[PDB]
Amino acid sequence: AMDPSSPNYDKWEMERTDITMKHKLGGGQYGEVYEGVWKKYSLTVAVKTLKEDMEVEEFLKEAAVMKEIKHPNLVQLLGVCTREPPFYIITEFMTYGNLLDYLRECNRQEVSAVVLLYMATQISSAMEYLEKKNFIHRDLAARNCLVGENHLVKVADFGLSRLMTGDTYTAHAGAKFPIKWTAPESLAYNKFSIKSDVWAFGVLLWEIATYGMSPYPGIDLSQVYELLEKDYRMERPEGCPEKVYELMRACWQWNPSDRPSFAEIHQAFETMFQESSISDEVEKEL
Ligand SMILES: Cc1ccc(NC(=O)c2ccc(CN3CCN(C)CC3)cc2)cc1Nc1nccc(-c2cccnc2)n1
Ligand SMILES: NC(=O)c1cccc(-c2cc(Nc3ccc(OC(F)(F)F)cc3)ncn2)c1
Ligand SMILES: [Cl-]
Numbered sequence: 001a002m003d004p005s006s007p008n009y010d011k012w013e014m015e016r017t018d019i020t021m022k023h024k025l026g027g028g029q030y031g032e033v034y035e036g037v038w039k040k041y042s043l044t045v046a047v048k049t050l051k052e053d054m055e056v057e058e059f060l061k062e063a064a065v066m067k068e069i070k071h072p073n074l075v076q077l078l079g080v081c082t083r084e085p086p087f088y089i090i091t092e093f094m095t096y097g098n099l100l101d102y103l104r105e106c107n108r109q110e111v112s113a114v115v116l117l118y119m120a121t122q123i124s125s126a127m128e129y130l131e132k133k134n135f136i137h138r139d140l141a142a143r144n145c146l147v148g149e150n151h152l153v154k155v156a157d158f159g160l161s162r163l164m165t166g167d168t169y170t171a172h173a174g175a176k177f178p179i180k181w182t183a184p185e186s187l188a189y190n191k192f193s194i195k196s197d198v199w200a201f202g203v204l205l206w207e208i209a210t211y212g213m214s215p216y217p218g219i220d221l222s223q224v225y226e227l228l229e230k231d232y233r234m235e236r237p238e239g240c241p242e243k244v245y246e247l248m249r250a251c252w253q254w255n256p257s258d259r260p261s262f263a264e265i266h267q268a269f270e271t272m273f274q275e276s277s278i279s280d281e282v283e284k285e286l
Pocket of ligand 2 (some may be wrong): 120241245282286
């Protein structure tokens with residue numbers, strides 16, 4: 001099946017022995033994801049596998065989806081091993097790891113307002129692409145983005161809901177939801193769409209603007225929906241330019257139809273500071 005002449009050929013299928021498997025990534029925070037080396041390229045990779053013994057079809061579904069998407073700001077599929085168990089999905093490795101930790105740990109002279117704007121812009125580009133292709137993310141947040149060289153940011157989906165410890169994800173409607181990132185219509189009506197990703201993007205924008213603070217700080221999960229329904233929204237973070245906060249507020253429109261498209265959001269990021277410096281706005285606000 002590995003030869004192009006074969007009727008069973010799949011360009012994505014790679015030789016398992018081409019990859020040298022190292023340790024589990026990030027202590028175990030990603031489940032069954034391992035650091036790897038793709039031998040012939042001397043390239044470090046991330047390798048997702050299945051744990052011993054119905055989630056097989058979900059895994060294969062993920063591999064199929066990843067074959068359909070290609071964008072500079074979406075984590076890139078490099079290959080799979082899905083002919084026989086154990087199944088692998090191989091992606092590029094991103095030097096600086098997840099964006100949430102990166103924000104919390106970064107040198108702030110380096111990761112200035114300009115860099116933060118670039119990170120937000122890149123994420124909106126990935127999401128504009130997903131929007132165009134009629135995909136939904138379903139769990140957009142800083143914890144699901146990666147950071148590489150020169151502040152490159154890629155959107156990922158690590159399937160965190162039943163891995164992550166703590167109260168980021170909590171029980172809701174038979175599953176685990178990240179309540180503070182979840183659009184109200186998703187919480188209340190189980191309605192997910194690109195517009196519920198827009199809501200989540202607004203929360204992610206707030207994470208960027210605060211260098212990774214936890215959203216709705218000090219507010220009980222039990223109160224989030226009621227507060228949002230009564231028009232409460234997180235306040236503008238310290239130093240946040242008004243035009244950026246306006247964009248956050250647009251993402252958090254109660255009616256999903258009133259929220260901007262990711263194409264509109266990306267355009268806004270390109271125009272917002274075309275003639276003016278984000279550094280100057282932050283300074284003005286402070
Ligand atoms: C090894 C692997 C296997 C699969 C995936 N998959 C994805 O990241 C992903 C992204 C977008 C989609 C699109 N999808 C559309 C439909 N909706 C419902 C879900 C999202 C699907 C999968 C990533 C990885 N990469 C990965 N995983 C965990 C950790 C890391 C990692 C950690 C630290 C440094 N560098 C890399 N890297
Ligand atoms: N040391 C300081 O002067 C100080 C104190 C508090 C906040 C900040 C601060 C805020 C800040 N905010 C900020 C920057 C960019 C931004 O746009 C985007 F979200 F990234 F798109 C939205 C908000 N950027 C850089 N520094 C600095
Ligand atoms: Cl989808």
